Amino acid sequence: SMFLPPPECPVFEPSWEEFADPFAFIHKIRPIAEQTGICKVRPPPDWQPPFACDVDKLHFTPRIQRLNELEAQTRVKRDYTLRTFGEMADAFKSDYFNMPVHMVPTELVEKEFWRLVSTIEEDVTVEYGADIASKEFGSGFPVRDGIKLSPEEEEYLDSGWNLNNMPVMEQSVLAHITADICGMKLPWLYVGMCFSSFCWHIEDHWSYSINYLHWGEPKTWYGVPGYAAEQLENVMKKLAPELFVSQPDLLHQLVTIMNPNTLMTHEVPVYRTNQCAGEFVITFPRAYHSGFNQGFNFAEAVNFCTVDWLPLGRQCVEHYRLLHRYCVFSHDEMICKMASKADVLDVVVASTVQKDMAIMIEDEKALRETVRKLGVIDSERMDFELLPDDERQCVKCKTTCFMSAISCSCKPGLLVCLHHVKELCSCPPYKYKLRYRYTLDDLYPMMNALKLRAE
Ligand SMILES: O=C(O)CCNc1cc(N2CCc3ccccc3CC2)nc(-c2ccccn2)n1
Ligand SMILES: [Mn+2]
Ligand SMILES: [Mn+2]
Ligand SMILES: [Zn+2]
Ligand SMILES: [Zn+2]
């Protein structure tokens, strides 16, 4: 009546043979799971990564969170010990419900969450932990350290489902990427409590994400399939226009809490699940998702990109361009980097990169012809990858340049991508320079190397 729980998302229970290769399994479940945006994965019963930590020696700075529906929160992120946070968290929930913490039904917490975030009179604030793996935090999974690991810990060091290993495996396209994008290859750690929430969002560059709940009380998820993303955005734009005004950078992007029933009322397909300890949740490209924690828990998450994602990654950067949204990295730079490493690429990877590069080259070919007809004649090679990101963004659309850009001596340091030549300055195009990374004659052999590797 008040709150109608969305239908359950798919739950997979792979055999050991299926589970062995994470990328093969994800590709297998993709036709099913991409229709729901999110899915849950229960590992084989004996796949049990050991969790060991001193609750007194793990410190982290908590972030404070107000729980109001449609209220703006920043998309990106005192001092607790893990023990003191746990004691705070446990006391909060038990006091909130006047019940032993482990006796509060998950359906009730869900019901109550959507009540309190909607009620203006309620002024509930909670805290959470969200941080990259550091020497003060550290992954929940076993990692190699100079100290001595137990045989059980060594058993899960090179596991495909050890979230530290996923970004650097052969079937992932971020295996040989150079530029430091710490947010997209390093796992994040999340310490949650009752009602602590993550707002509606999609991952950077429409990448996958995989989440593992190491221990604690469940994490409640809501998911929307990739094909319904723009439908969701139109709904939220009409109800919360503040989230759609342009921002100075990525650190200022706004997100919010919204009842899934509101989305469902506007015919947006929403699915739910309760992620329990020891279970994986996987989010698919452009799959909007949000949720909250049932109680004190500890989760670890990392982004990743498969060969299936590559053409979507290009579409995303194009979408970023239309929105004047900042990139985390240059998609074209990634592609050309992989091309320069063709001989050591996985053969299926090489084949997929080849296809994307062909599109890249033909688009670049047309763009350069266009700007030449605009009067830009002079040109010089430029190593874009050497520039800091904020020193090679298009003035107009904020895209990260790599293949090419336009410069003018009248605006030293300023660049525009080839889509926005008319946005650089007021001086005539013959004063401009085409700054390019590769000639067309450089690019075709690079793509040929990929073709040979793919055979
Ligand atoms: O809660 C979990 O276990 C993970 C939920 N997923 C989150 C959680 C999360 N949090 C950090 C930022 C944030 C923003 C607003 C409210 C709460 C939080 C805490 C969780 N951030 C992100 C994020 C950020 C940037 C790009 C892509 N994803 N994803
Ligand atoms: Mn409220
Ligand atoms: Mn996220
Ligand atoms: Zn000028
Ligand atoms: Zn531009």
Nearest to 262 by CA among 244, 288, 239, 291: 239
H/E/C letters for each residue in the chain?
Answer: CCCCCCCECCEECCCHHHHHCHHHHHHHHHHHHCCCCEEEECCCCCCCCCCCCCCCCCEECCEEEECCCCCCEECCCCCEEHHHHHHHHHHHHHHHHCCCHHHCCHHHHHHHHHHHCCCCCCCCEEEEEEEECCCCCCCCCCCCCCCCCCHHHHCCCCCCCCCCCHHHCCCCCCCCCCCCCHHHCCCEEEEECCCCEEEEECCHHHCEEEEEEEEECCEEEEECCHHHHHHHHHHHHHHCHHHHCCCCCHHHCEECCCCHHHHHHCCCCCEEEEECCCCEEEECCCCCEEEEECCCEEEEEEEECCCCCHHHHHHHHHHHHHHCCCCCCCHHHHHHHHHCCHHHCCHHHHHHHHHHHHHHHHHHHHHHHHHHHCCCCEEEECCHHHCCHHHCEECCCCCECCCEEEEECCCCCCEECCCCHHHCCCCCHHHEEEEECCCHHHHHHHHHHHHHHHC
Q: Same domain for 231 and 122?
A: yes
Q: Which atom of ligand 1 is nearest to the CA of 197?
A: 17
Cα–Cα distance, 59 to 196 (Å, whole number): 19
CB 391, CB 330: distance < 8 Å: no
Q: Which atom of ligand 1 is nearest to the CA of 300?
A: 3
Cα–Cα distance, 153 to 150 (Å, whole number): 5
CB 142, CB 156: distance < 8 Å: yes
Computed on alpha carbons and rounded to an integer, the radius of gyration of the chain in Å comes to: 24
Neighbours of ion ligand 2 (CB under 5 A): 68, 122
The coordinates were experimentally obtained by X-ray
First to last CA, the chain: 59
The residues that bridge with 131 in the sheet, in sequence order, are 189
* CB of 356 sitting under 6 A from ligand 1: no
- Give Cα separations from 378 to 282, 334, 407 (angstroms): 48, 27, 10
- Residues annotated within the binding site for Fe cation are 201, 203, 289
Angle, to 10 degrees, between the axis of helix 347-373 and the axis of helix 331-339?
A: 120
- Measured in angstroms, how far is the CA atom of residue 33 from the centroid of ligand 2? 33
Cα–Cα distance, 368 to 357 (Å, whole number): 16
Q: Same domain for 161 and 66?
A: yes
Q: Same domain for 335 and 218?
A: no
How many independent structural domains does the chain possess?
2
Cα–Cα distance, 60 to 215 (Å, whole number): 18
- Measured in angstroms, how far is the CA atom of residue 293 from the centroid of ligand 3? 14
Order across the sheet with 271-275: list the strands: 197-201, 289-293, 219-223, 271-275
Strands 11-12 and 38-41: parallel
* CB of 73 sitting under 6 A from ligand 1: yes
- Give Cα separations from 313 to 67, 208, 349, 390, 404 (angstroms): 33, 11, 14, 21, 19
Q: Same domain for 203 and 69?
A: yes
The residues that bridge with 126 in the sheet, in sequence order, are 65
* CB of 254 sitting under 6 A from ligand 1: no
Q: Same domain for 292 and 438?
A: no
Task: Note the ligand closest to the C-alpha atom of 404.
Answer: 5
Nearest to 275 by CA among 255, 258, 300: 300
- Measured in angstroms, how far is the CA atom of residue 72 from the centroid of ligand 2? 13
- Give Cα separations from 27 to 113, 186, 431 (angstroms): 34, 22, 50
Considering 327, 357, 379, which residue would you say is the last residue of a domain?
A: 327
Q: Same domain for 66 and 203?
A: yes
Considering 327, 350, 377, which residue would you say is the last residue of a domain?
A: 327
* CB of 300 sitting under 6 A from ligand 1: no
Tokens of 169: 């495996």
Task: Note the ligand closest to the C-alpha atom of 421.
Answer: 5
- Measured in angstroms, how far is the CA atom of residue 419 from the centroid of ligand 5? 5
- Measured in angstroms, how far is the CA atom of residue 192 from the centroid of ligand 3? 14
* CB of 190 sitting under 6 A from ligand 1: yes
Q: Same domain for 286 and 334?
A: no
Identify which of 69, 77, 320 to mutate to test ligand 1's pocket (most ligand atoms within 8 A of the CB).
Answer: 77
Q: Which atom of ligand 1 is nearest to the CA of 128?
A: 19
Considering 305, 327, 349, which residue would you say is the last residue of a domain?
A: 327
Tokens 């809501």 -> residue? 222
CB-based burial label for 6 (10 Å; 0-12, 13-18, 19+): buried
154 phi and psi angles, rounded to 5 deg: -65, -30
Cα–Cα distance, 39 to 43 (Å, whole number): 13
- Residues annotated within the binding site are 128, 201, 203, 209, 211, 219, 289
Nearest to 408 by CA among 389, 427, 392, 390: 427
Nearest to 444 by CA among 357, 379, 333: 357
CB 265, CB 77: distance < 8 Å: no
CB 200, CB 289: distance < 8 Å: yes
The angstrom resolution of this structure is 2.2
CB-based burial label for 236 (10 Å; 0-12, 13-18, 19+): buried
Cα–Cα distance, 272 to 376 (Å, whole number): 53
Q: Same domain for 404 and 427?
A: yes
Task: Note the ligand closest to the C-alpha atom of 420.
Answer: 5
Q: Which atom of ligand 1 is nearest to the CA of 192?
A: 1
What distance separates the 2 farthest-apart alpha carbons in the chain? Answer: 75
The residues that bridge with 219 in the sheet, in sequence order, are 275, 293
CB 131, CB 137: distance < 8 Å: yes
- Measured in angstroms, how far is the CA atom of residue 78 from the centroid of ligand 2? 24
CB 105, CB 93: distance < 8 Å: no
Range of the domain at 432: 328-455
CB 404, CB 418: distance < 8 Å: yes
Identify which of 128, 188, 191, 198 to mutate to test ligand 1's pocket (most ligand atoms within 8 A of the CB).
Answer: 198
Q: Same domain for 160 and 16?
A: yes
Neighbours of 415 (CB within 10 A): 23
Tokens of 353: 């990169």
Q: Same domain for 279 and 218?
A: yes
Tokens of 117: 């975030």
- Measured in angstroms, how far is the CA atom of residue 410 from the centroid of ligand 4? 4
Q: Same domain for 75 and 180?
A: yes
Amino acid identity for residue 105 in this structure: P
Domain CATH for 53? 2.60.120.650
Q: Same domain for 95 and 240?
A: yes
Tokens 């396209």 -> residue? 173
Order across the sheet with 404-408: list the strands: 378-381, 432-436, 404-408
Q: Which atom of ligand 1 is nearest to the CA of 213?
A: 3
